[PDB]
Design an enzyme around this catalytic site. Structure first.
Site, PDB file in Angstrom:
ATOM      1  N   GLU A 119     -12.065 -17.291   2.198  1.00  0.00           N
ATOM      2  CA  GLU A 119     -12.821 -16.388   1.335  1.00  0.00           C
ATOM      3  C   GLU A 119     -13.154 -17.110   0.037  1.00  0.00           C
ATOM      4  O   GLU A 119     -12.390 -17.092  -0.931  1.00  0.00           O
ATOM      5  CB  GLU A 119     -12.015 -15.100   1.108  1.00  0.00           C
ATOM      6  N   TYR A 191     -16.050  -3.705   3.832  1.00  0.00           N
ATOM      7  CA  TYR A 191     -15.242  -2.839   2.995  1.00  0.00           C
ATOM      8  C   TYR A 191     -15.082  -3.535   1.633  1.00  0.00           C
ATOM      9  O   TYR A 191     -15.650  -4.611   1.405  1.00  0.00           O
ATOM     10  CB  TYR A 191     -13.924  -2.455   3.677  1.00  0.00           C
TER      11      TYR A 191
HETATM   12  C1  LIG Z   1     -19.331  -6.627  -1.389  1.00  0.00           C
HETATM   13  C2  LIG Z   1     -18.335  -7.514  -2.201  1.00  0.00           C
HETATM   14  O1  LIG Z   1     -18.451  -8.705  -2.202  1.00  0.00           O
HETATM   15  N1  LIG Z   1     -17.329  -6.871  -2.937  1.00  0.00           N
HETATM   16  C3  LIG Z   1     -16.339  -7.585  -3.758  1.00  0.00           C
HETATM   17  C4  LIG Z   1     -14.886  -7.129  -3.382  1.00  0.00           C
HETATM   18  O2  LIG Z   1     -14.555  -7.713  -2.175  1.00  0.00           O
HETATM   19  C5  LIG Z   1     -13.857  -7.607  -4.445  1.00  0.00           C
HETATM   20  O3  LIG Z   1     -12.644  -6.951  -4.239  1.00  0.00           O
HETATM   21  C6  LIG Z   1     -11.591  -7.728  -3.838  1.00  0.00           C
HETATM   22  O4  LIG Z   1     -11.790  -7.946  -2.485  1.00  0.00           O
HETATM   23  C7  LIG Z   1     -10.870  -8.847  -1.970  1.00  0.00           C
HETATM   24  C8  LIG Z   1     -11.410  -9.362  -0.634  1.00  0.00           C
HETATM   25  O5  LIG Z   1     -11.178  -8.394   0.360  1.00  0.00           O
HETATM   26  C9  LIG Z   1      -9.499  -8.117  -1.896  1.00  0.00           C
HETATM   27  O6  LIG Z   1      -8.579  -8.974  -1.357  1.00  0.00           O
HETATM   28  C10 LIG Z   1      -9.140  -7.786  -3.391  1.00  0.00           C
HETATM   29  O7  LIG Z   1      -8.060  -6.977  -3.484  1.00  0.00           O
HETATM   30  C11 LIG Z   1     -10.256  -6.944  -4.051  1.00  0.00           C
HETATM   31  N2  LIG Z   1      -9.999  -6.761  -5.488  1.00  0.00           N
HETATM   32  C12 LIG Z   1      -9.707  -5.481  -6.022  1.00  0.00           C
HETATM   33  C13 LIG Z   1      -9.444  -5.382  -7.517  1.00  0.00           C
HETATM   34  O8  LIG Z   1      -9.643  -4.504  -5.343  1.00  0.00           O
HETATM   35  C14 LIG Z   1     -14.369  -7.244  -5.870  1.00  0.00           C
HETATM   36  C15 LIG Z   1     -13.344  -7.632  -7.013  1.00  0.00           C
HETATM   37  O9  LIG Z   1     -13.042  -8.974  -6.932  1.00  0.00           O
HETATM   38  O10 LIG Z   1     -15.594  -7.843  -6.092  1.00  0.00           O
HETATM   39  C16 LIG Z   1     -16.608  -7.283  -5.280  1.00  0.00           C
HETATM   40  O11 LIG Z   1     -17.790  -7.885  -5.640  1.00  0.00           O
HETATM   41  C1  LIG Z   2      -9.264 -10.188   7.133  1.00  0.00           C
HETATM   42  C2  LIG Z   2      -9.132  -9.693   5.648  1.00  0.00           C
HETATM   43  O1  LIG Z   2      -9.328  -8.534   5.373  1.00  0.00           O
HETATM   44  N1  LIG Z   2      -8.808 -10.646   4.653  1.00  0.00           N
HETATM   45  C3  LIG Z   2      -8.671 -10.294   3.205  1.00  0.00           C
HETATM   46  C4  LIG Z   2      -7.233  -9.754   2.904  1.00  0.00           C
HETATM   47  O2  LIG Z   2      -6.563 -10.804   2.289  1.00  0.00           O
HETATM   48  C5  LIG Z   2      -7.247  -8.533   1.938  1.00  0.00           C
HETATM   49  O3  LIG Z   2      -5.931  -8.010   1.837  1.00  0.00           O
HETATM   50  C6  LIG Z   2      -5.118  -8.471   0.800  1.00  0.00           C
HETATM   51  O4  LIG Z   2      -4.510  -9.632   1.221  1.00  0.00           O
HETATM   52  C7  LIG Z   2      -3.809 -10.315   0.184  1.00  0.00           C
HETATM   53  C8  LIG Z   2      -3.618 -11.755   0.706  1.00  0.00           C
HETATM   54  O5  LIG Z   2      -4.922 -12.311   0.711  1.00  0.00           O
HETATM   55  C9  LIG Z   2      -2.519  -9.508  -0.147  1.00  0.00           C
HETATM   56  O6  LIG Z   2      -1.863 -10.092  -1.202  1.00  0.00           O
HETATM   57  C10 LIG Z   2      -2.960  -8.048  -0.578  1.00  0.00           C
HETATM   58  O7  LIG Z   2      -1.839  -7.244  -0.656  1.00  0.00           O
HETATM   59  C11 LIG Z   2      -3.956  -7.407   0.513  1.00  0.00           C
HETATM   60  N2  LIG Z   2      -4.552  -6.070   0.169  1.00  0.00           N
HETATM   61  C12 LIG Z   2      -5.459  -5.828  -0.908  1.00  0.00           C
HETATM   62  C13 LIG Z   2      -5.890  -6.960  -1.816  1.00  0.00           C
HETATM   63  O8  LIG Z   2      -5.882  -4.748  -1.114  1.00  0.00           O
HETATM   64  C14 LIG Z   2      -8.222  -7.461   2.526  1.00  0.00           C
HETATM   65  C15 LIG Z   2      -8.200  -6.089   1.702  1.00  0.00           C
HETATM   66  O9  LIG Z   2      -9.412  -5.397   1.920  1.00  0.00           O
HETATM   67  O10 LIG Z   2      -9.526  -7.899   2.536  1.00  0.00           O
HETATM   68  C16 LIG Z   2      -9.819  -9.284   2.767  1.00  0.00           C
HETATM   69  O11 LIG Z   2     -10.188  -9.752   1.542  1.00  0.00           O
END
Ligand SMILES: CC(=O)N[C@@H]1[C@@H](O)[C@H](O[C@@H]2O[C@H](CO)[C@@H](O)[C@H](O)[C@H]2NC(C)=O)[C@@H](CO)O[C@H]1O
Ligand SMILES: CC(=O)N[C@@H]1[C@@H](O)[C@H](O[C@@H]2O[C@H](CO)[C@@H](O)[C@H](O)[C@H]2NC(C)=O)[C@@H](CO)O[C@H]1O
Ligand SMILES: [Mg+2]
Length: 376
Positions: A119, A191
């Site tokens: 990512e 999501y």
């Molecule tokens: C459509 C898009 O790109 N949305 C972005 C979100 O994915 C992102 O949220 C973060 O997403 C990560 C990837 O799944 C999660 O692991 C992480 O927890 C989550 N951060 C929060 C605070 O929920 C946000 C914020 O970085 O940016 C959007 O642009």
């Molecule tokens: C396949 C997938 O969804 N990958 C990402 C996940 O990593 C992310 O979940 C978050 O993973 C972190 C490790 O990368 C954990 O520390 C965290 O607890 C966990 N949950 C969060 C950030 O909310 C998921 C969440 O949508 O999305 C992807 O970004």
């Protein structure tokens, strides 16, 4: 259809009834289970938790109660960042070190394939050459897996990838037509499309755009993202729609302003089991709903939201899972993936909707189980 279910190796640390390990998984719900996450050290795949080898055995032992179940190991994730992937793909030698380690690791611990969760190539600090080098990695891994199947006389390991749902990240990261030739499945992270980072309320995984959304805001829905992948080179049957079993939370600046787009402040409240600002598991959501929250169906987007005092939640429920499963079937996609099974009401004791209410909804809609060959 496939139903791909992520399990997370840190769910075991949640307090009380939140704790979840592989033996809590119903082996018949999904077609594929994906273990999140392995790490990387010196360009080689590695465990991350002290008990991963034990959990791998419990995970792959689930196949002892389902002869069709397949398992994959996911590497990376959001919190893994990009630098180790950039270094690993930068040279053919580093890629071969990684690929060789993956083959040995998956075969030793009982996995049927690797899910690449970088990512993301080309974003979050990854330099522009990584867009093409990701394709090179995936091509070399697919070809190495093909050769190992010949050499070991076994069915080849699968190679899949979890891929961005944000359009800017997709454009910076992926050579979609070439990648799609080599990946077995493409798990699209449809999501985290809205959240407290925006400063106003919005839905986590709306199926459709909100009626007033235009331009780049109109990218933030499942329909657009999935069709973006499809129409830029990925076959529909390889595309897997992402389903969240959690919601995002917000603090309303004014409790009376509580629709879509209402202004918010800060990162959003944390739940007592997941203990992370802005995020509640489905079982935590049920606790909130039962306590008197106001529930609204966002009709244009086919998802629920709820609020109580200055707390606001954008989430998914049985109804929205059902609508989106119908949609993916009617658009010829390959199935669904869930993030993550340990966030469903796995005990059945928080939501009064049976065990695994959200995952079971998809199991039924996607024809995963039964085929009982008589009236039901
Ligand atoms: C459509 C898009 O790109 N949305 C972005 C979100 O994915 C992102 O949220 C973060 O997403 C990560 C990837 O799944 C999660 O692991 C992480 O927890 C989550 N951060 C929060 C605070 O929920 C946000 C914020 O970085 O940016 C959007 O642009
Ligand atoms: C396949 C997938 O969804 N990958 C990402 C996940 O990593 C992310 O979940 C978050 O993973 C972190 C490790 O990368 C954990 O520390 C965290 O607890 C966990 N949950 C969060 C950030 O909310 C998921 C969440 O949508 O999305 C992807 O970004
Ligand atoms: Mg064309």
């Amino acid at each position: 259809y496939n139903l791909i279910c992520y399990f997370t190796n840190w769910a075991q640390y949640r307090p009380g009834l939140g704790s979840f390990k592989p033996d809590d998984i119903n082996p018949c719900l999904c077609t594929h289970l994906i273990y999140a996450f392995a790490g990387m050290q010196n360009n080689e795949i590695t465990t991350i938790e002290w008990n991963d080898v034990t959990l791998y055995k419990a995970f792959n032992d689930l196949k002892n109660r389902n002869s069709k179940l397949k398992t994959l190991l996911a590497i990376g994730g959001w919190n893994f960042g990009t630098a180790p992937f950039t270094t690993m793909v930068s040279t053919s030698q580093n890629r071969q070190t990684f690929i060789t380690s993956v083959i040995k690791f998956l075969r030793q611990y009982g996995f049927d394939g690797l899910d690449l969760d970088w990512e993301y190539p080309g974003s979050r600090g990854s330099p522009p050459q990584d867009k093409h080098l990701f394709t090179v990695l995936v091509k070399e891994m697919r070809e190495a897996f093909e050769q190992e199947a010949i050499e070991s006389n076994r069915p080849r390991l699968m190679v899949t990838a979890a891929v961005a749902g944000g359009i800017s990240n997709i454009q910076a990261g992926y050579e979609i037509p070439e990648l799609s030739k080599y990946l077995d499945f493409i798990h699209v992270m449809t999501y985290d499309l809205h959240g407290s980072w925006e400063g106003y309320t919005g839905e986590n995984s709306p199926l459709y755009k909100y009626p007033t959304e235009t331009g780049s805001n109109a990218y933030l829905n499942v329909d657009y993202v999935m069709n973006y992948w499809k129409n830029n080179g990925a076959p529909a049957e390889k595309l897997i729609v992402g389903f969240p079993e959690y919601g995002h939370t917000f603090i309303l600046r004014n409790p009376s302003d509580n629709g879509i787009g209402a202004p918010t402040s800060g990162d959003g409240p944390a739940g007592p089991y997941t203990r992370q600002a802005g995020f509640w598991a489905y079982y935590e959501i049920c606790t909130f709903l039962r306590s008197g929250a106001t529930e609204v169906w966002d009709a244009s987007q086919e998802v629920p939201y709820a609020y109580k005092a200055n707390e606001w939640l954008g989430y998914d429920n049985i109804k929205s899972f059902s609508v989106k499963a119908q949609w993916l079937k009617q658009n010829n996609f390959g199935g669904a993936m869930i993030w993550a099974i340990d966030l469903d009401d796995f005990t059945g004791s928080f939501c009064d909707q049976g065990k695994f209410p959200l995952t079971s909804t998809l199991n039924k809609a996607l024809g995963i189980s039964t085929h009982h060959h008589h009236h039901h």
